[PDB]
UniProtKB/Swiss-Prot annotation, chains A, B:
Motif (Cell attachment site, crucial for protein stability): 140-142
Subcellular location: Secreted; Nematocyst; Target cell membrane
Protein name per its UniProtKB record: DELTA-actitoxin-Aeq1a
Effect annotated for changing W41F: Expressed only 7% of the wild-type hemolytic activity
Start and end residues of each stretch annotated as Plays an important role in the hemolytic activity: 1-8
Residues of the full protein shown: 40 to 214 of 214
One GO term of the biological process aspect: cytolysis in another organism
Residues annotated for phosphocholine binding in this entry: S50, V83, S101, P103, Y129, Y133, Y134
Domain notes from UniProt: Composed of a long N-terminal alpha-helix and a core region rich in beta-sheet structures. Before the pore formation, the alpha-helix binds the lipid membrane, partitions into the lipid-water interface and stabilizes the monomeric molecule on the membrane. Finally, it traverses the bilayer, thus forming the transmembrane pore.
Gene Ontology annotations for the cellular component aspect, listed alphabetically: extracellular region; nematocyst; other organism cell membrane; pore complex
Organism of this sequence: Actinia equina
This protein's record includes keyword Transport: yes
Main location group: secreted
Length: 175, 175
């Protein structure tokens, strides 16, 4: 069970300790999503293209709170990373989705992330991963902040670093 | 399983986030113990005089790492405080014991804590709690740091606040 902390407490430092707490795995990610949307989010599901998470998505994330989640590559001598999608059903029946991609091979790939509000209840799956990763303009994990109007009177402001031990911090707020 | 982070990452803010993650309970405590003793610690056990914890002590806390732990009122409708002792067996065969006491009723009680190294492997129990509280001069949760040489070439510096939403952070280092 991932933690649900005060929105204002989410920071790079909290995410870096989550990363430290995961241990010396080659590819891992600490994810923080601050809910300032004015609507309560209810965990829907996650989908991992590569890797796993030892924890589950926090069930409820009220406005003013942030969820902490993490993921990592499958354990053992396997050249893979941590890539997946987490989805939350918003109070209005729409789905907030977050993509994270921490590849094993940095010679040909880079870190990417994305966030999007889908209409209606949309579970995370292979299609959503492909949609978010290839066709819906993901942001690079480039050690820089990125802001995007999500429609529905909200916007996201997020940051993801460039390394294999990644942190992804996103704030969803009212436009 | 409580988190094991880099010792230099342990801070009041990290502990404050651990507290928030426990949700709205009247009595709860976030404990952080940074091992800079020069010796590896192996979890021994915990003893709760009041309250409980929904996690266990991280098994191994090597030099340079800090353990994160927590406690709270009893599982159930019965409102209590969070009072107990956690014990770690150091590399030399001696036991690092830590007392934390967050009472239910502040009219007659206050926050207290204590740190002490026992000779040999000594499991936390009712007796160790009695000793650390009634016999061995515990420190008050008075928003102040307190230093005490522990013997074995080590000292402890700790801080605890005074509220029912308690934070106790201790650094064990070379004297």
């Amino acid at each position: 069970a991932g933690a649900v902390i005060d929105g204002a407490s989410l920071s790079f430092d909290i995410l870096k300790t989550v990363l430290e707490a995961l241990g010396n795995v080659k590819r891992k990610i600490a994810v923080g999503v601050d809910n300032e949307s004015g609507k309560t989010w209810t965990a829907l599901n996650t989908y991992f293209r590569s890797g796993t998470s030892d924890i589950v998505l926090p069930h409820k994330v009220p406005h003013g709170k942030a969820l902490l989640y993490n993921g990592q590559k499958d354990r053992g001598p396997v050249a893979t990373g941590a890539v997946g999608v987490l989805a939350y059903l918003m109070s209005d029946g729409n789905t907030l989705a977050v993509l994270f991609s921490v590849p094993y091979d940095y010679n040909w790939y880079s870190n990417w992330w994305n966030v999007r509000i889908y209409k209606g209840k949309r579970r995370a799956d292979q299609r959503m991963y492909e949609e978010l990763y290839y066709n819906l303009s993901p942001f690079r994990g480039d050690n820089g902040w990125h802001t995007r109007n999500l429609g529905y009177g909200l916007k996201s402001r997020g940051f993801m670093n460039s390394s294999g031990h990644a942190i992804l911090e996103i704030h969803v707020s009212k436009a």
